[PDB]
Design an enzyme around this catalytic site. Structure first.
Site, mmCIF file in Angstrom:
data_model
loop_
_atom_site.group_PDB
_atom_site.id
_atom_site.type_symbol
_atom_site.label_atom_id
_atom_site.label_comp_id
_atom_site.label_asym_id
_atom_site.label_seq_id
_atom_site.Cartn_x
_atom_site.Cartn_y
_atom_site.Cartn_z
ATOM 1 N N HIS A 67 12.699 -5.994 21.777
ATOM 2 C CA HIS A 67 14.074 -6.484 21.571
ATOM 3 C C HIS A 67 14.389 -7.667 22.450
ATOM 4 O O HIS A 67 14.327 -7.631 23.643
ATOM 5 C CB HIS A 67 15.023 -5.331 21.879
ATOM 6 C CG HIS A 67 16.486 -5.714 21.770
ATOM 7 N ND1 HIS A 67 17.333 -5.116 20.868
ATOM 8 C CD2 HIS A 67 17.211 -6.667 22.439
ATOM 9 C CE1 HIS A 67 18.524 -5.762 20.939
ATOM 10 N NE2 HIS A 67 18.461 -6.617 21.902
ATOM 11 N N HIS A 110 11.630 -0.496 21.360
ATOM 12 C CA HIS A 110 12.118 0.651 20.662
ATOM 13 C C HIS A 110 11.530 0.797 19.309
ATOM 14 O O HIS A 110 11.180 -0.154 18.673
ATOM 15 C CB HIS A 110 13.659 0.784 20.662
ATOM 16 C CG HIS A 110 14.362 -0.342 19.990
ATOM 17 N ND1 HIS A 110 14.486 -0.474 18.649
ATOM 18 C CD2 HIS A 110 14.988 -1.444 20.526
ATOM 19 C CE1 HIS A 110 15.246 -1.561 18.375
ATOM 20 N NE2 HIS A 110 15.606 -2.170 19.506
ATOM 21 N N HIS A 112 11.697 0.912 15.481
ATOM 22 C CA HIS A 112 12.535 0.215 14.528
ATOM 23 C C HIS A 112 12.224 0.711 13.104
ATOM 24 O O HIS A 112 12.182 -0.032 12.117
ATOM 25 C CB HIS A 112 12.352 -1.308 14.622
ATOM 26 C CG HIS A 112 13.613 -2.072 14.350
ATOM 27 N ND1 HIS A 112 14.388 -1.849 13.260
ATOM 28 C CD2 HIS A 112 14.240 -3.028 15.070
ATOM 29 C CE1 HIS A 112 15.447 -2.692 13.288
ATOM 30 N NE2 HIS A 112 15.398 -3.397 14.414
ATOM 31 N N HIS A 400 23.519 -7.576 16.668
ATOM 32 C CA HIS A 400 22.313 -8.130 17.229
ATOM 33 C C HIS A 400 21.536 -8.905 16.217
ATOM 34 O O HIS A 400 21.449 -8.478 15.063
ATOM 35 C CB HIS A 400 21.418 -6.962 17.802
ATOM 36 C CG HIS A 400 20.044 -7.399 18.149
ATOM 37 N ND1 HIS A 400 19.798 -8.330 19.105
ATOM 38 C CD2 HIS A 400 18.802 -6.911 17.763
ATOM 39 C CE1 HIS A 400 18.509 -8.526 19.220
ATOM 40 N NE2 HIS A 400 17.882 -7.712 18.384
ATOM 41 N N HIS A 452 22.019 -7.021 12.542
ATOM 42 C CA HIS A 452 22.570 -5.681 12.294
ATOM 43 C C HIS A 452 23.382 -5.152 13.443
ATOM 44 O O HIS A 452 23.204 -5.622 14.572
ATOM 45 C CB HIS A 452 21.404 -4.673 11.965
ATOM 46 C CG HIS A 452 20.408 -4.448 13.058
ATOM 47 N ND1 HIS A 452 20.580 -3.510 14.067
ATOM 48 C CD2 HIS A 452 19.225 -5.050 13.282
ATOM 49 C CE1 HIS A 452 19.530 -3.552 14.861
ATOM 50 N NE2 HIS A 452 18.724 -4.518 14.452
ATOM 51 N N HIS A 454 23.774 -2.549 16.222
ATOM 52 C CA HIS A 454 22.745 -1.816 17.019
ATOM 53 C C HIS A 454 23.187 -0.422 17.307
ATOM 54 O O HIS A 454 22.419 0.258 18.017
ATOM 55 C CB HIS A 454 22.375 -2.580 18.264
ATOM 56 C CG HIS A 454 20.925 -2.474 18.624
ATOM 57 N ND1 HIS A 454 20.301 -1.256 18.905
ATOM 58 C CD2 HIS A 454 19.977 -3.408 18.715
ATOM 59 C CE1 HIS A 454 19.053 -1.508 19.209
ATOM 60 N NE2 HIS A 454 18.793 -2.763 19.076
ATOM 61 N N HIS A 458 24.532 3.408 12.354
ATOM 62 C CA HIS A 458 25.195 2.446 11.438
ATOM 63 C C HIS A 458 24.202 1.587 10.714
ATOM 64 O O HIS A 458 24.328 1.335 9.516
ATOM 65 C CB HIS A 458 26.184 1.604 12.227
ATOM 66 C CG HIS A 458 27.284 2.371 12.806
ATOM 67 N ND1 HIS A 458 28.241 1.752 13.587
ATOM 68 C CD2 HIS A 458 27.614 3.674 12.764
ATOM 69 C CE1 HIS A 458 29.119 2.632 13.997
ATOM 70 N NE2 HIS A 458 28.736 3.829 13.538
HETATM 71 CU CU CU Z 1 16.982 -3.571 19.883
HETATM 72 CU CU CU Z 2 28.252 -0.201 14.172
HETATM 73 CU CU CU Z 3 16.036 -7.135 18.294
HETATM 74 CU CU CU Z 4 16.788 -4.745 14.843
HETATM 75 F F F Z 5 15.178 -9.331 19.014
#
Ligand code: CU
Ligand code: CU
Ligand code: CU
Ligand code: CU
Ligand code: F
Ligand SMILES: *[C@@H]1O[C@H](CO)[C@@H](O[C@@H]2O[C@H](CO)[C@@H](O)[C@H](O)[C@H]2NC(C)=O)[C@H](O)[C@H]1NC(C)=O
Ligand SMILES: *[C@@H]1O[C@H](CO)[C@@H](O[C@@H]2O[C@H](CO)[C@@H](O)[C@H](O)[C@H]2NC(C)=O)[C@H](O)[C@H]1NC(C)=O
Length: 497
Positions: A67, A110, A112, A400, A452, A454, A458
Site C-alpha cells: 500500500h 495487506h 487485497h 485511497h 476505493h 479503504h 465497503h
Molecule cells: Cu491499503
Molecule cells: Cu467507506
Molecule cells: Cu493501495
Molecule cells: Cu486497494
Molecule cells: F497503493
C-alpha cells in the site's frame, strides 16, 4: 527482526488470541501483525509470497498489495485481485518483484482479496531514507518505533452475517489489546523509551474499518510524515487516523520516568478505556512494571486538523487554482443503498479477467473493459481532479488511490480549498454531509489503478472504480513476467472457471 528487501513470505492459517479469545487467522510470517518488510529508497523488493493456506473459511487463495508504493512499470505487482492479477492459489508462490524509486516513508502490506486482510494478513512496510531530511529530529527509528493500530473481530470476515451491523471486538495496538465485551486482563503492548531520547514513531493504521483518536497521556506528537510524504513539523496532542493512513511523529521522552497510557479510541466498537480496552503502555526505562495511572484530558488542546499539514518540500498543486482547474476534472457520485455502494451508479463487482489482463489482451477503451461502467480511462500526462462529495452512509469514508499520491485540495469539514500548499497523501477521509473533499494528481504512471474506500467492508460491498490510466501505453510500460501470465490459468483451472 525486519525482513526484506529480498525475502520469502509465507501465508498460513493458525490460531491466535491477541485479546485472549482464540480464533483462526490468515497470517503473514506467522504473526499478527505480520513482520515488517523493509528496505531503503530505490531498493529492489523481491517478496516471494508462498500461499500455504488450507482453511476455506478465510479463503485459500490470496493476493498481496503494497500500500502506497507506486509500482511504476510493475502494475502487475500491485496486488488488487481482479484489477492487476488473479489470486495465488494454495500450494503455489509468486514473486512480487518491484522497485521503490523516489519514495521513502511508512507504508504497509495487506491481502487485497475480498475481506481477507481483516482475517489477519496485514503488516508494516518501511522504506528508509539514508539521507532523510528529518533525520536530525530524532535519535531512534527502528522496528521498536513502529506502532500499528488494528481492529480485531471474533467473527470471521467471510462469516459476518448478511444485513447485521459489523463492529469489531477489540482494538489491538502492536498486536495486543483487550476485548470490548467479556473483557479479560490479557497482556497489553508496551512501547519502551529512554528518558531524554527522541523517537520517530511510525504510526500505521492497518484498520479494516474504524478510525482512531490516537494519543499518549502526558506527551505530544510532532508530525513529520503523512502517508509517505515528508511534512513540516506539526505538533499535536491527538491524531484522528483513518483506515490505511500513516503518520510519523517525533516523540520526545521528556516526561518523568514512568508509565503513560497510549490511547486509540475507535469511532465504533467499545467506547472508553474501562478494563484497559483501547490501550497500550508507554514505559520509560527504569519505571516500575505496572499500569499507568495517567488520565486523558476532557478536551485535547491541539488535535490534528488536516489543513494544518504542509509538505516539507515545495510540492505545490498541479493545475489551476479553482474548481475544475484541471485537464480532466471529475466529480464522483458516491452513494449507498440496500447494502451496496456505488460510484456514478455502478457498484463494483470484481471481474473474471483482471483489468490489466484485459488491457494486455487488446481492449483499448474503458467502455470495452469489464466491469462495465466500473473502469474510467485517464489520459496521459494530464492533471486530474477528483471531487469526492460525502453523504453516503457508513462514513466518514477514507478514499485511497493506488499507483499515486495526491494533493488534498479540500479536506473534511472545511469548505475552503487550498491550491497553494496542501498536504499530499494517499488515503483521505471525505468527511461528512455537504463536504467536498477533492484531490489532484498528474498521470505519469500507465496502468489500471484502483480507487476505493479503504473500509474493507465497503470495498467488498462495491465502493470502488478502476482508473485505467494511459491505456495505450499500459502494455509497453508494464512488461509482465511469465509467472504473472501463469496466474489466471492456474486460478481458473483450480476454480473450474
Ligand atoms: Cu491499503
Ligand atoms: Cu467507506
Ligand atoms: Cu493501495
Ligand atoms: Cu486497494
Ligand atoms: F497503493
Ligand atoms: C464539489 O466540487 C465540484 C467541482 O470540483 C462541483 O462540481 C460542479 O457541479 C455543478 C453541479 O453541482 C456543475 O454545474 C459543474 O459543472 C461542476 N464543476 C465545476 C463548477 O467545476 C460540485 O458541485 C461540488 N459538490 C458539492 C457537494 O459541493
Ligand atoms: C480551512 O482550510 C483553509 C484552506 O486550507 C485554511 O486556510 C488557510 O489558513 C492558513 C492558516 O491561517 C492561512 O495561512 C492560509 O492562507 C489559508 N489558505 C486559504 C486558501 O484560505 C483554514 O485555516 C482552514 N480552517 C481551519 C479552521 O483550520
Amino acid at each position: 527482526a525486519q525482513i526484506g528487501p529480498v525475502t520469502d513470505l509465507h501465508i498460513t492459517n493458525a490460531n491466535i488470541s491477541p485479546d485472549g479469545f482464540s480464533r483462526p487467522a490468515v497470517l503473514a510470517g506467522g504473526t499478527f501483525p505480520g513482520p515488517t518488510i523493509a528496505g531503503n529508497t530505490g531498493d529492489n523488493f523481491q517478496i516471494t509470497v508462498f500461499n500455504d493456506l488450507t482453511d476455506p473459511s478465510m479463503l485459500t487463495d490470496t493476493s498481496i498489495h503494497w500500500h502506497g508504493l507506486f509500482q511504476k512499470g510493475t502494475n502487475w505487482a500491485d496486488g488488487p485481485a481482479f484489477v492487476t492479477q488473479c489470486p495465488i492459489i494454495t500450494g503455489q508462490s509468486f514473486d512480487y518483484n518491484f522497485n521503490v524509486p523516489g519514495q521513502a516513508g511508512t507504508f504497509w502490506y495487506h491481502s487485497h482479496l475480498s475481506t481477507q486482510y481483516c482475517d489477519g494478513l496485514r503488516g508494516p512496510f518501511v522504506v528508509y531514507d539514508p539521507n532523510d531530511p528529518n533525520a536530525s529530529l530524532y535519535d531512534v527509528d527502528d522496528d521498536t518505533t513502529i506502532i500499528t493500530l488494528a481492529d480485531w473481530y471474533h467473527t470471521l470476515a467471510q462469516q459476518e452475517p448478511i444485513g447485521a451491523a459489523i463492529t469489531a471486538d477489540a482494538t489491538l495496538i502492536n498486536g495486543l489489546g483487550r476485548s470490548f465485551t467479556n473483557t479479560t486482563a490479557s497482556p497489553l503492548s508496551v512501547i519502551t523509551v529512554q528518558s531524554g531520547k527522541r523517537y520517530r514513531m511510525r504510526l500505521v493504521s492497518i484498520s479494516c474499518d474504524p478510525n482512531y483518536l490516537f494519543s499518549i497521556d502526558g506527551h505530544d506528537m510532532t508530525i513529520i510524515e503523512v502517508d509517505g510524504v515528508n511534512s513540516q513539523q506539526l505538533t499535536v496532542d491527538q491524531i484522528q487516523i483513518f483506515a490505511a493512513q500513516r503518520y510519523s511523529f517525533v516523540l520526545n521522552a521528556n516526561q518523568p520516568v514512568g508509565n503513560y497510557w497510549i490511547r486509540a479510541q475507535p469511532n465504533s466498537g467499545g467506547q472508553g478505556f474501562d478494563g484497559g480496552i483501547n490501550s497500550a503502555i508507554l514505559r520509560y526505562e527504569g519505571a516500575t512494571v505496572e499500569d499507568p495511572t495517567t488520565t486523558a484530558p476532557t478536551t485535547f488542546s491541539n488535535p490534528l486538523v488536516e489543513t494544518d499539514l504542509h509538505p516539507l518540500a515545495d510540492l505545490g498543486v498541479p493545475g489551476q487554482p479553482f474548481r475544475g482547474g484541471a485537464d480532466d476534472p471529475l466529480v464522483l457520485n458516491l452513494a449507498f443503498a440496500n447494502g451496496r455502494f456505488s460510484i456514478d451508479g455502478v457498484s463494483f463487482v470484481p471481474p473474471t479477467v483482471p483489468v490489466l489482463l484485459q488491457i494486455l489482451s487488446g481492449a483499448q477503451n474503458a467502455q470495452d473493459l469489464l466491469p462495465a461502467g466500473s473502469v474510467i480511462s485517464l489520459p496521459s500526462n494530464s492533471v486530474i481532479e477528483v471531487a469526492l462529495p460525502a453523504g453516503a452512509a457508513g462514513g466518514p469514508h477514507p478514499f485511497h488511490l493506488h499507483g499515486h499520491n495526491f494533493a488534498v485540495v479540500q479536506s473534511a469539514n472545511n469548505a475552503t480549498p487550498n491550491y497553494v500548499n496542501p498536504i499530499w497523501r494517499d488515503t483521505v477521509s471525505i468527511g461528512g454531509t455537504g463536504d467536498n473533499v477533492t484531490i489532484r494528481f498528474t498521470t505519469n504512471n500507465p496502468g489500471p489503478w484502483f480507487l476505493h474506500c479503504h473500509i474493507d467492508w465497503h470495498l467488498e460491498a462495491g465502493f470502488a472504480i478502476v482508473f485505467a490510466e494511459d491505456i495505450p501505453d499500459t502494455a509497453s510500460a508494464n512488461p509482465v513476467p511469465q509467472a504473472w501470465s501463469d496466474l489466471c490459468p492456474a486460478y481458473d483451472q483450480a476454480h473450474n472457471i
